[PDB]
């Protein structure tokens, strides 16, 4: 009965942790913010429609100059767009078209992608040859690639359906650190602003905070009732929201280790595909299966606005580093720029 | 206006032209999703239609370019990636007929045939596959003739009251699979009794795909 003694001891530890969280839940964020003014009229308009993809879009990523962005679609194309002019800068043909994620290196020198091929391919955008070349194929995951984020030009973090995350040395192509402990498909990860921590969301309805350099799980966050499809750090690195199939977004503070607020409406019953904060953190933008993006007041949980400009699932969105615009990508094959 | 952007706008249109020309090829492609429990005969079908996640193969027949995707080893939740295959032309579902009498494993819940039937129920009724034709290859018919001589079908179907002839058992199994389709009026299953030597199966998939093309053109032309 060793498995019995351990399974019962885990229940006592959970009760201790639950009690410790309750012990420091002296107030709620919602009652703290009653006094502050609402954000009011959020009237966002479509300023650009990026046309040219011919299949569902699943991912995009802004470059750090807030002007270039990359998008990945099942037509087997990785397109880099100049969002100011809408010019296509590059169209990269993928060896496998079953992509689920893409990423822009913070330097702008590289993009990455991958998917049901279980491979994260690294693409050099700045060759002497004049074209874009695959520089690395990161192999070793045993399930689909669900997310990836560069740390720098030589390190990248990946998430996989094999329930693990991994830190890769791009130069050598080797998995140097693994992140195990999730018990379901890992769907999303988010790098801390200082890149010392990242958070991941999995199909076990939990989020986990990981220490990049130590290679282990610092904290575990529960509360969602179903799949976590999306996750995003608060801009100061002290909190993160969690897009989930339960049509809810539960921002979790790291240091207080618990949920502060839920964002939901009785008439929203669809899954959430994507979340992102505005530059100041005041606005929480979320993409919904019902084809809309909802703009939430992150401090008061009221809906501030709606972006209704797509004819199919919004699969991805992102806010520029300067905060000037948000892009939404959709299964309808178009991207739109809003501000 | 457009001092050096003129050469940039020209480049955008020159690569926007190659996207259009590469999408015209893809729209003529017949996309096939191969499914089935392990050892159901899937890789044998691949060999028949011929001379790391999604194993892929392509082949030409009667001037049609087929693209077949074998999900293969994919240890993950189907519900999270299956919607990626929305829009495939046809599903090829392989079933090992001779698996009906396989003894349960140590902790196996159901026999091999019933797990295959469960997989078919989930696929046929999947919300992303409502308008997709299902082609069913009931495979390994040769082994079935040897097994059915000595092992009764009641091992697999305790309610079966027929005889242990090939004809009665094969017809009953086919009915049992096709009865799982809850949308028979909107979706049509194309059932073939292939084997290890059968060669008309590629023709069967070609004929089934041609009907699917007719439905799409009738849908597009407004007649449906």
């Amino acid at each position, epitope marked *: 009965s060793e498995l019995d003694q351990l399974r019962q001891e885990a229940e006592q530890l959970k009760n201790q942790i639950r009690d410790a969280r309750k012990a420091c839940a002296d107030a709620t964020l919602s009652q703290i913010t009653n006094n502050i003014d609402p954000v009011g009229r959020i009237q966002m308009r479509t300023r650009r429609t990026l046309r040219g993809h011919l299949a569902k879009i699943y991912a995009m990523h802004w470059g750090t100059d807030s002007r270039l962005l990359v998008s990945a679609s099942q037509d087997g194309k990785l397109i880099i767009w100049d969002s100011y002019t809408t010019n296509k800068v590059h169209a990269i043909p993928l060896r496998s078209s079953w992509v689920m994620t893409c990423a822009y290196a913070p330097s702008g020198n590289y993009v990455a992608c991958g998917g049901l091929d279980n491979i994260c391919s690294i693409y050099n955008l700045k060759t002497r040859e004049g074209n874009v070349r695959v520089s690395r194929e990161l192999a070793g995951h045993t399930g689909y690639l669900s997310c990836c984020r560069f740390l720098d030009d030589n390190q990248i973090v990946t998430s996989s359906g094999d329930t693990t995350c991994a830190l890769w040395d791009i130069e050598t192509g080797q998995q140097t650190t693994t992140f195990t402990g999730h018990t379901g498909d890992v769907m999303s990860l988010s790098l801390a602003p200082d890149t010392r921590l990242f958070v991941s969301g999995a199909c076990d309805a939990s989020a986990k905070l990981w220490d990049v350099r130590e290679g282990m799980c610092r904290q575990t966050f529960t509360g969602h009732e179903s799949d976590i499809n999306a996750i995003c750090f608060f801009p100061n690195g002290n909190a993160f929201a969690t897009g989930s199939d339960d049509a809810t977004c539960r921002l979790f503070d790291l240091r207080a280790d618990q949920e502060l607020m839920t964002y939901s409406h009785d008439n929203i019953i669809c899954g959430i595909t994507s979340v992102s904060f505005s530059k100041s953190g005041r606005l929480l933008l979320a993409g919904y299966d019902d084809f809309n993006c909802n703009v939430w007041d992150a401090l008061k949980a009221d809906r501030a606005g709606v972006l209704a400009g797509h004819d199919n699932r919004v699969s991805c969105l992102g806010v520029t580093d300067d905060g000037m615009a948000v892009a939404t990508g959709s299964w309808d094959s178009f991207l739109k720029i809003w501000n | 206006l457009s001092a*050096e952007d003129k050469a940039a706008v020209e480049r955008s249109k020159m690569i926007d032209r190659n996207l259009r020309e590469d999408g015209e090829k893809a729209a003529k492609e017949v996309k096939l999703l191969l499914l089935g429990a392990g050892e159901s005969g899937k890789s044998t079908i691949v060999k028949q239609m011929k001379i790391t996640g999604i194993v892929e193969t392509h082949f030409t027949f009667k001037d049609l370019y087929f693209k077949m995707f074998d999900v293969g080893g994919q240890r993950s939740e189907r519900k999270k990636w299956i919607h990626c295959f929305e829009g495939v032309t046809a599903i090829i579902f392989c079933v090992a007929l001779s698996d009906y009498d396989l003894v349960l494993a140590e902790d196996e819940e159901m026999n091999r045939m019933h797990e295959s039937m469960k997989l078919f129920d989930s696929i046929c009724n999947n919300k992303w596959f409502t308008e997709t034709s299902i082609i069913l290859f009931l495979n390994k018919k040769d082994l079935f003739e040897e097994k059915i001589k000595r092992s009764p079908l009641t091992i697999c179907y305790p309610e079966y009251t027929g005889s242990n002839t090939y004809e009665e058992a094969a017809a009953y199994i086919q009915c049992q699979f096709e009865d799982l389709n809850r949308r028979k009026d909107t979706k049509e299953i194309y059932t073939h009794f292939t084997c290890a030597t059968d060669t008309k199966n590629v023709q069967f998939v070609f004929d089934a795909v041609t009907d699917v093309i007719i439905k799409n053109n009738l849908k597009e032309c407004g007649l449906y």
Partner: single-chain antibody
Amino acid sequence: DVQLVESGGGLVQPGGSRKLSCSASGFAFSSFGMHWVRQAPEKGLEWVAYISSGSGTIYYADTVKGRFTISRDDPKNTLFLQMTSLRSEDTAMYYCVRSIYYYGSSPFDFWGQGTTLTVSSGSDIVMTQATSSVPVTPGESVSISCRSSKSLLHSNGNTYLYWFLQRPGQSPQLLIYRMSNLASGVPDRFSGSGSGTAFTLTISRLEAEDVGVYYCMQHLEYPLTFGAGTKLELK
């Protein structure tokens, strides 16, 4: 390894015809807007013709339109210049130049080796390098100047000024694109600045190999035009 090898030069009688070729290897020729630039024996650089990627756009210099035809054969990675009615004023070294144009690109980033041609016996922006030569000593710091008759700053925010270095006996090499951007592979001791009409190239701790002729060039509008060049002499 990027290579551009021109051929077809030689001695020709006036009024005759001659076809130059430029053979490309080591890069994606097709996707590169080619440029023919020529240099008279003891003179500066003069732009001759341009053919875009895809051949959709062709520009000629005024002094050559009607007489010269530029073409490319993409499958064989070759550039052509068909010349006719050759005059004595066409005697020059002819450089083949690659130039790719997209957001953040570096045009004019590789020049051919050049081929020698010998012929027997207004609205354009003027580029001015008022200083024809400068004596320098290693380790010192130099500032070369250039001015434009029109503002090179565009409403998009870019200022379309390029700096090239021609070492003695070699093809020109890009140093600075769009006035302030440092070209790839060029040491960080070079830097460019200016505003609108007047511009400055500054070298810090000048070394031995730095000696040569420095040309400025405008890419605001066609025809592209160079400065007369500023020479750096050793003391």
